[PDB]
Structures are given as C-alpha cells and as structure tokens.
Amino acid sequence: MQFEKVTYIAVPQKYGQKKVGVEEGPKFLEKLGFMNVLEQVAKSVNKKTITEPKTPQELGVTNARNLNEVESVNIELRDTIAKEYDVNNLLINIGGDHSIGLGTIAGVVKAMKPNARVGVVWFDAHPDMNTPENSPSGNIHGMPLACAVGLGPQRLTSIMPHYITPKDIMYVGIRSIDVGEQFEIQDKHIDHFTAEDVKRVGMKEVIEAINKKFVDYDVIHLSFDIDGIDPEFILGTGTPVPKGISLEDSLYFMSEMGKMKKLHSVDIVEYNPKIEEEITGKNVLKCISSLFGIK
Amino acid sequence: QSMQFEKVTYIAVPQKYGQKKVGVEEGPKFLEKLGFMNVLEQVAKSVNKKTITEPKTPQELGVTNARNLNEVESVNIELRDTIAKEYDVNNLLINIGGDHSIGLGTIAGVVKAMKPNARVGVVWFDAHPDMNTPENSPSGNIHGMPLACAVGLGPQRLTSIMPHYITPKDIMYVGIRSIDVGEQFEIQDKHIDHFTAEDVKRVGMKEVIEAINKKFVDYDVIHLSFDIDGIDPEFILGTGTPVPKGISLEDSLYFMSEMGKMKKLHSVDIVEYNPKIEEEITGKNVLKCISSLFGIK
Numbered sequence: 001m002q003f004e005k006v007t008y009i010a011v012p013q014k015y016g017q018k019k020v021g022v023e024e025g026p027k028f029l030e031k032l033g034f035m036n037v038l039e040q041v042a043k044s045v046n047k048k049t050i051t052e053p054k055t056p057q058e059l060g061v062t063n064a065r066n067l068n069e070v071e072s073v074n075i076e077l078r079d080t081i082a083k084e085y086d087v088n089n090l091l092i093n094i095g096g097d098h099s100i101g102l103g104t105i106a107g108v109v110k111a112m113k114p115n116a117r118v119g120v121v122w123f124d125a126h127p128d129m130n131t132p133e134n135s136p137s138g139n140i141h142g143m144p145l146a147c148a149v150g151l152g153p154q155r156l157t158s159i160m161p162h163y164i165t166p167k168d169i170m171y172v173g174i175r176s177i178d179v180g181e182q183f184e185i186q187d188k189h190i191d192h193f194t195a196e197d198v199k200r201v202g203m204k205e206v207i208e209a210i211n212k213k214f215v216d217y218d219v220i221h222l223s224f225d226i227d228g229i230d231p232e233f234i235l236g237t238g239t240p241v242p243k244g245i246s247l248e249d250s251l252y253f254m255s256e257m258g259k260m261k262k263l264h265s266v267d268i269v270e271y272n273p274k275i276e277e278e279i280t281g282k283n284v285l286k287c288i289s290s291l292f293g294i295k
Numbered sequence: 296q297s298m299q300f301e302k303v304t305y306i307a308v309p310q311k312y313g314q315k316k317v318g319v320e321e322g323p324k325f326l327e328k329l330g331f332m333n334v335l336e337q338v339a340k341s342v343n344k345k346t347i348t349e350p351k352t353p354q355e356l357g358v359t360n361a362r363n364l365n366e367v368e369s370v371n372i373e374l375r376d377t378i379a380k381e382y383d384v385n386n387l388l389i390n391i392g393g394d395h396s397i398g399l400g401t402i403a404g405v406v407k408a409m410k411p412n413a414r415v416g417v418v419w420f421d422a423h424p425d426m427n428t429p430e431n432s433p434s435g436n437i438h439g440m441p442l443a444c445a446v447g448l449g450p451q452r453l454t455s456i457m458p459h460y461i462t463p464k465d466i467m468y469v470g471i472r473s474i475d476v477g478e479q480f481e482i483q484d485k486h487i488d489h490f491t492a493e494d495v496k497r498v499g500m501k502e503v504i505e506a507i508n509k510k511f512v513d514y515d516v517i518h519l520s521f522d523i524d525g526i527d528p529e530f531i532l533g534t535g536t537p538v539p540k541g542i543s544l545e546d547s548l549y550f551m552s553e554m555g556k557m558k559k560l561h562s563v564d565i566v567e568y569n570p571k572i573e574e575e576i577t578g579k580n581v582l583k584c585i586s587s588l589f590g591i592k
C-alpha cells in the first residue's frame with residue numbers, strides 16, 4: 001500500500017504576511033530530515049519548487065498587501081498542481097504562509113472535471129475567511145478561504161477555475177475568529193470544531209464527522225496550518241494562539257486523515273524557522289510522519 | 296547560478312557493502328541535512344529523486360575474495376536500470392553514495408542508456424584506481440574493484456552487469472596516489488591515462504582539464520565519478536580510506552568548476568562520504584565541490 005511516487009512542491013511564500021522566514025519552511029524541514037521521511041513512503045519523489053518572488057515587502061497600511069506576489073505564486077502553484085495531481089499518488093505542498101491555500105485548492109479544482117466535488121479540511125487556529133474590506137491586517141494569509149468561495153478581490157478570486165462553497169469546508173481547531181468570519185460560519189452553517197470543541201468531544205468524533213461529511217465527495221484536500229496546534233509544541237509560527245490542539249491529538253488527527261482514501265493532497269503551512277527552528281520543525285515532522293503512518 | 300536545467304535527477308545510493316565501515320550508507324541523508332536539496336534548487340525547479348533499495352543483511356567480515364557480493368550485485372543492478380531510464384543528455388543526473396562499488400552500477404547505467412555503439416568516457420577522481428580483482432585485492436572489498444569489473448576483469452556476477460565493457464583507453468584518473476600491485480600493472484600495461492596527485496601539483500589542474508577535453512573529443516558522453524578521498528585529508532576527514540598528499544580543496548573546486556562546463560558531461564557520482572567518521576567539515580566541503588560543479592561559489 002506504498003505509493004509509486006510522492007509529489008513534493010516547495011512553496012517559498014512570505015508575502016501573505018509581514019514576518020520574514022516562513023519562506024524558508026521547506027528548506028528547514030529538509031535540513032531536519034523531511035526527504036528521509038518521504039523515503040519511507042515512496043522510492044520516487046518528484047520535487048517542484050515554486051518561484052520565490054524577490055521584491056521588497058509592502059510594510060505600510062493597506063487592505064491587500066503584496067497582491068502581485070500572492071497572485072503570481074498562487075497561479076504558478078495552481079498550474080503545477082493541475083499537472084501533477086494524481087488520485088493514485090500523494091501530493092504534499094510545504095509552505096510558506098497560508099495565502100498559498102488559495103493556489104492549492106485552485107490547483108485541485110483545476111485538476112478535476114468541472115462537476116467534481118472537492119472537500120476541504122482546514123486545520124488552523126484561524127478560519128482565513130476575511131476580505132480586504134474587513135481584514136484587520138491586510139495580510140492575504142487571512143483571506144484564502146474567502147477567495148476560494150468567491151469573496152475577495154477579482155485578481156484572487158479569478159484564480160479559482162470555479163468557486164468551492166461554504167458547505168465544502170470542515171474547520172478543525174479554530175479559536176481566533178474575526179467578526180466577518182463568525183458571520184460567515186454562522187450564516188452559511190459552515191461545519192467546524194473549535195479547539196474547545198475538540199477537547200470536549202475528542203478527535204475520534206472529529207474524524208467520524210469528516211468521514212460522514214465527505215462520503216459523497218470525489219476528493220478531499222487537507223490544509224494543515226501548524227498554528228492549529230497549541231503553542232507549547234509549535235513556537236516557530238507567525239500568529240500563535242493559546243489553547244490549541246494538543247500534539248497528541250494532532251498526531252492522531254494526521255494518522256486518521258492519512259487513512260482516508262479520498263485524500264490525495266496535503267498542505268503544511270506557516271512554519272517560520274527564524275522564529276523558532278528545532279522544537280517546532282521536529283514536531284512538524286512528527287505530524288507529517290503520522291500522516292504517512294510512520295510516526 | 297551558471298547552470299540551469301529543466302530537471303536534475305538525484306539518485307541516493309545508500310550502499311556500505313563494498314567496504315567494512317558502517318556509515319557511508321548515510322552519505323545522502325547527511326548531505327540533505329547540510330542543504331543538498333537547496334543546492335539543487337539553484338540549478339533546476341524540478342528534482343526527480345530516486346532511492347536505491349538499501350540491503351539490511353549482516354556484513355560478511357571473514358576471509359573472502361569478494362565480500363558481500365549479493366549486496367553489491369543487487370544494488371548495482373537496480374542502480375544501472377534506474378540510470379538507464381532517467382539518463383538524459385539535456386539534463387543532469389547526480390548519484391550520491393555510498394561506497395565506490397556503486398561506480399560499476401553508475402557506469403553500467405550510462406552504458407545501458409546509450410546505444411550499444413556509444414563511446415562513454417570516464418573521469419575517475421580518487422586516491423585509488425579501484426582496479427583490483429578478487430584474485431589480487433588485499434582486502435576483498437568490492438569498492439576497490441569497480442573499474443576492473445567495468446572493463447570486464449572480475450567475477451561474472453559483477454562484470455555481467457555491464458551491457459558491454461568499457462576499455463582501459465576510456466578512463467582518465469585524477470588524484471591517484473595509493474596504488475596496489477595489480478592496479479600498477481593494469482595502468483602501465485594498458486597505458487591508462489592518469490594524473491597522480493603529485494602530477495597535478497607539478498603541472499596544474501588547468502593542464503589536467505585540457506587533457507580531459509582533448510581525450511574525450513572522440514566520445515559521445517563523459518561520466519564523472521568523484522571519490523571524495525581524492526581530496527587531501529586536511530579538508531575531507533569523513534571517509535573510510537583517507538590518504539595523505541591529496542588534491543587541495545582549491546584545485547578540487549577548480550576541477551569541478553571546469554568539469555561542469557563540459558557539454559558531454561551529463562552524469563556525476565559523489566561517493567565515499569562517511570558522516571559517522573566526521574560529519575560537518577567534510578559534508579560542508581563535499582557540498583562546496585558539488586556547488587562548484589554547478590557553477591555556484
């Protein structure tokens with residue numbers, strides 16, 4: 001039950017937010033042995049590197065910071081995924097900030113027929129459903145799921161071949177929610193477990209709910225923001241939020257997601273090794289290992 | 296910088312069975328730890344990595360003329376066949392070892408990838424000629440035999456890995472300085488082209504490169520097999536058989552830079568890094584050599 005190949009896309013993207021270092025996520029996971037983890041799962045790894053923009057960061061007040069760089073990266077990412085996505089193998093995107101989630105989901109959508117049903121599990125402290133009109137920061141990493149459902153600037157929403165819908169989303173771990181996001185979650189009845197919910201009901205129930213929700217879907221895509229995890233375990237990340245998912249629960253979650261036959265693509269985002277390298281990187285590699293059944 | 300390809304093929308070859316020390320099978324893993332993939336990122340947006348199966352059997356540590364023959368055979372066959380599929384005259388293939396017994400598989404693979412009438416040139420950068428046979432080997436370690444096997448001198452199970460043999464006229468040695476009785480015989484009897492490390496010091500690496508360019512004009516492709524113990528032990532400590540009075544790091548970097556400019560070079564082996572002997576100084580100097588090959592300083 002081993003794969004013929006893993007497609008590994010490194011996405012050195014920082015322009016969805018303001019802190020330097022998140023673009024070196026892939027390079028530092030490699031340093032800590034990511035390729036050796038992939039070696040236990042496939043003899044062939046096809047690595048792709050998305051071009052890193054090199055322009056000066058826009059660090060002032062704006063409603064949509066460094067839109068050119070988020071657009072260019074997400075388009076390249078979408079088109080690379082569209083070509084490499086394969087229901088018999090595994091695709092792993094390593095970020096980079098969570099603005100790349102627009103590109104990853106667009107790419108899965110592009111790879112499938114127009115009538116396909118694509119499910120998204122979004123493991124995160126944040127719903128990432130703000131727009132430039134309500135964003136508290138102007139940081140596009142807080143907007144990708146809004147763009148994916150068609151709420152956002154044209155330059156970004158048009159990256160989607162067509163929109164997913166709020167019924168396609170399952171949140172896991174959310175706990176830092178803005179006014180506009182609370183409105184969307186309640187108004188559109190978006191399925192979710194907050195971190196408190198997880199603590200109360202257990203991760204076994206979360207997995208059962210995911211299995212039931214996506215039973216009639218064609219594929220599932222997992223987008224795993226490491227800041228979903230409690231900051232005791234994950235320090236090297238730009239927006240840590242207390243009272244997160246335990247590492248034990250996160251490993252179980254990844255292990256169970258990895259057994260889902262409809263899952264063929266996973267994003268691992270928001271590792272900033274310049275904030276903290278070793279404890280964080282090693283816990284990230286545990287999560288990835290657990291996804292693959294290693295540990 | 297300098298070198299851009301559509302793709303690099305990277306084959307990790309975790310082979311220790313050509314010799315007796317543990318750790319040389321972890322060469323690839325430790326070069327990755329030190330940033331090998333980031334080096335490849337400067338050269339291509341696509342890297343196709345393959346990993347050759349690591350055997351897990353006990354090392355054969357008694358008296359024999361050809362130690363762990365099953366494990367060297369198995370790895371070299373898989374290596375040959377993987378290279379045969381991925382070898383490409385418009386891109387680059389890099390095999391990271393692992394001990395030098397893998398040089399039989401790498402050369403066989405280049406030969407298999409080409410037409411049966413192709414002329415394949417080999418530059419062998421090494422302290423050792425690696426042209427012993429089981430009958431004259433002082434150790435029974437197959438890492439000292441691959442070039443003998445490639446020219447058809449060796450046990451059938453290894454020589455038959457070659458689709459056809461290369462000949463001693465196809466070889467250029469650089470850096471050789473530790474030579475056994477049987478290797479000295481082959482070098483002088485077959486007039487094998489070489490520069491010893493002392494030769495290099497006397498004539499300069501510029502002359503070595505010119506001789507390589509001139510020799511391989513008649514050939515279709517060149518394959519470089521780079522044993523890090525060619526380099527002086529001041530710079531390369533993490534290796535199983537270090538030999539003093541080696542090629543300077545400066546000359547080795549120049550050598551790699553110039554090899555990388557050769558249009559006929561489409562495949563390179565980097566062998567004999569044993570990080571369990573010494574990890575950091577060695578690994579970082581190995582990555583400099585690889586970087587220089589690609590034009591990065």
Ligand SMILES: N=C(NO)NCCC[C@H](N)C(=O)O
Pocket residue numbers: 098124125126128130135136137138139141142143178225227238239270
């Ligand atoms: N770490 C990222 N993605 O999960 N956080 C994004 C949202 C932070 C905050 N809600 C904002 O829009 O500024």
Ligand SMILES: N=C(NO)NCCC[C@H](N)C(=O)O
Pocket residue numbers: 395421422423425427432433434435436438439440475522524536567
């Ligand atoms: N370091 C490796 N690859 O060059 N081999 C060295 C062999 C030493 C000696 N000639 C022997 O056959 O045992």
Ligand SMILES: [Mn+2]
Pocket residue numbers: 098124126128141225
């Ligand atoms: Mn996120």
Ligand SMILES: [Mn+2]
Pocket residue numbers: 098124125126225227228239270
């Ligand atoms: Mn987040």
Ligand SMILES: [Mn+2]
Pocket residue numbers: 395421423425438522
């Ligand atoms: Mn050698």
Ligand SMILES: [Mn+2]
Pocket residue numbers: 395421422423522524525536567
């Ligand atoms: Mn040697």
